[PDB]
Design a binder for these strands. Structure first.
Lengths: 55, 55
RNA sequence: GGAUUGUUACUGCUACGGCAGGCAAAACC
């Protein structure tokens, strides 16, 4: 995977291999980071998955 | 609904009746906003849901 | 950038309670 958009120093977005938008929050797993690098799985505390807002 | 947390003016976290954490992405929906208030459903562009980083 | 919000790195400070810097963001200027 890869960072799609850094939301904060402990939260970043990332497109899954399938093509879904996912968010990865963790202890400083997004500090001074950028898009294109793989999300550090060792610092992943919570992963969110894009859902349908219609529901 | 309610704003549990905020990462940036466009994305924020929120807890539903299931007791799970969900992230709500939108355009400038978190600007000048805070936690505790109901999440603006009209500003919800993409919703997210906490998952297990183990998978 | 400016500003406005967010924050858990790490840092500087201390009253050593935390607090601010930094860092980030798709408002707006």
């Amino acid at each position: 995977m890869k960072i799609a958009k850094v939301i904060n120093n402990n939260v970043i977005s990332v497109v899954n291999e399938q093509g879904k938008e996912l968010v990865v929050m963790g202890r400083g797993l997004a500090f001074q980071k950028k898009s294109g690098d793989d999300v550090d799985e060792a610092r992943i505390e919570k992963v969110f998955t894009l859902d349908n807002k219609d529901v």
